[PDB]
Design a binder for this molecule. Sequence first.
Ligand code: W9V
Ligand code: NAG
Length: 765
Amino acid sequence: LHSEIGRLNNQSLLWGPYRPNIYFGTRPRIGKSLMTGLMWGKIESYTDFQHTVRYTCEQNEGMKGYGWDEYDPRRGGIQSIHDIQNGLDITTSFVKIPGGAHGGSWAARIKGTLNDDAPKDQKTIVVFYVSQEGENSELEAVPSENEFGYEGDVILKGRSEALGNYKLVVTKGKGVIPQSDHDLSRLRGPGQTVVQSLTYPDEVLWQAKPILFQQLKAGIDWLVENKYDVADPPPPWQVYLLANKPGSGNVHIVQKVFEGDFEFDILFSSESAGKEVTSKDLEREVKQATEVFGERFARVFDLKAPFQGDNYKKFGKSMFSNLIGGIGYFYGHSLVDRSYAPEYDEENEGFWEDAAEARARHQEALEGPYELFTSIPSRPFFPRGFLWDEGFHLLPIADWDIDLALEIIKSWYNLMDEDGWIAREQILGAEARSKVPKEFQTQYPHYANPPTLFLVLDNFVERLRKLDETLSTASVDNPEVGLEYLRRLYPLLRRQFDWFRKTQAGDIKSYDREAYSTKEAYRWRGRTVSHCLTSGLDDYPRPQPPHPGELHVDLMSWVGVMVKSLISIGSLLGATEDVEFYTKVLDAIEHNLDDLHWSEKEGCYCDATIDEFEEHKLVCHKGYISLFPFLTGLLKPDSPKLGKLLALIGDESELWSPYGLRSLSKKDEFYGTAENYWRSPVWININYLAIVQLYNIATQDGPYKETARDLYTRLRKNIVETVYRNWEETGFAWEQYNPETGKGQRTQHFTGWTSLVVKIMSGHH
Ligand SMILES: O=[N+]([O-])c1cc(-n2nccn2)ccc1NCCCCCCN[C@H]1C[C@](O)(CO)[C@@H](O)[C@H](O)[C@H]1O
Ligand SMILES: *[C@@H]1O[C@H](CO)[C@@H](O)[C@H](O)[C@H]1NC(C)=O
């Protein structure tokens, strides 16, 4: 039965607009297969199109905004793009139609509406670009009746092992197609839809922009050669319209030119399914998908006071659809340093210099291929998998569709190497690598990242304890299915656990350090003088200078989170030997957090180092780090230490700003210094953990019940309102928020853990 659900899930999730790095494109969850992409740009001159054409996602002054208004990966959705540079409001509707044996069918509608400021007679070039990778697969454009191109639809017929037979149609569409009275029209046609069919070596098919331009340039060179000149030039758009050359190949370029408003359809018809997909099919399914999205939203993200109003609902749908709409499929090789240079052990004072020398050896090599199905922090700036981010992304997603979340978790854990390492950033394939400078592609098997995917597993366990609709929840509705899933994953969870304790271990035994356990102490590998990228909190101040004797309270708390989940899952599977080992580790972390990390003087947890005189020193910087035991759910509700932390959380002169909790205290000497990344700004991911823990204390008997209730109420309010105010003003989710002004700053389109706001609004943890 588990196997059966598995196959139905596979078939449900196969097709998607799973190329979030571009404005609009489709690929299936198959490494070497059929991919599509949309390009458009106005043409006003002989030289402008190369600067106006749009393809990969960006964010600058020429783009107002873009994102998904509604999206469900099983059904599809609607995206809105607001392009100032090209004077266009664009809609892309995508819809999946289940059927046959091959992942089903889909269709898309592309609609362009000139905005008020555009010339009514603007010429806009639109290209649909289609590639297919694979040794044995075929794809052919049926030629037109007409000499020079297509009056009606363009049909591509193709076959592959993965997809069987299929047909992909690009429809004629609605809108004025401009006509040229030039001489050139005797050879190139007055103006019509054109197709060029080409072939390149498989591994470069993703390079749609250069491939397209190489064709445009050959078109222009042909003009020059055949005596078309500045004495009498064809209009720009006709100079940039490819000569029609349909045929067979692994690349097909479908090009149309429109004057004014346009719309056209893409219909992918899986032959193994019923009748083929029509435009009337698409309209119906689009309407239907909306309805279903509407209902599921109202049940799953039913926003509680004071966010019940329709304004916060629109906001909620936008933050949610952009998060779930960022889901991508990636495939390819990664760049890994597999030297295990001894310098990476970081055992010496000055270790950061040793490690730089090992890096300078450049022993990294491509390895794989790997695949990954994950959501992402940002379409324009970070369109790829991030380990601790994904823990946050999946919390709202799991509410929506637990089976989908579990798929993504599975996908991540399938990357894990024999040692238990998962790279904190998954740059898979040359396409993914094009967006990342060479110097930052290399992954390092000694680099951890917070194990936040365990939080999702906690939510799933608690749910398990207590057709598209059915599949979304099959893993909780059929207890048998959930347990089997946990059975298969449990070994990998434990391998990761062991890996942390093996590679991220701190040094108790070789220093004058007293503590309850001699085992439980952690230090993030990978720190530089100014940074600790592996912790997730890039530049939060840490002991200076870095030192093999450092201990990190955040890392120890993350180990706590892991043991707790291993206890819960271990029990469910009855692994009793295991459960008792974990129990004693948890016990030891509880004591050791106090012995090594608690400052009585400062009233909070701190990182530690060892002195000039080789004794243990607490190093306190009041901020997110300081609350870690509390954030991660490790403190007893009656704890006096907890009450001291509530004091710190609540204190306006420290952490509490009108906009949410500051990353670092205003009192800390490092407040707002250097790059000021994690040294004052408000971050939604950590605010979310605080909110969730405040609510936990607020809805149980204990001494802090009422303080927690007050803080919970206020902090939920401030975080949602800060994110909502900025969304209203700017159209975007931001990476972080300014505690002095409330303004969003750094990266836009950060959905991204900023979307946790949908969960905070809807309450009832
Ligand atoms: O600055 N580069 O070296 C660089 C430049 C480009 N680039 N610039 C122009 C073209 N390409 C691309 C990549 C890199 N990588 C180095 C890493 C520095 C930025 C790290 C920020 N990490 C935050 C976001 C996030 O990492 C993800 O949400 C969270 O996980 C963390 O927690 C957050 O703190
Ligand atoms: C989906 O099914 C195909 C064919 O059965 C299989 O090879 C593929 O790995 C599946 N995808 C995953 C791992 O989810």
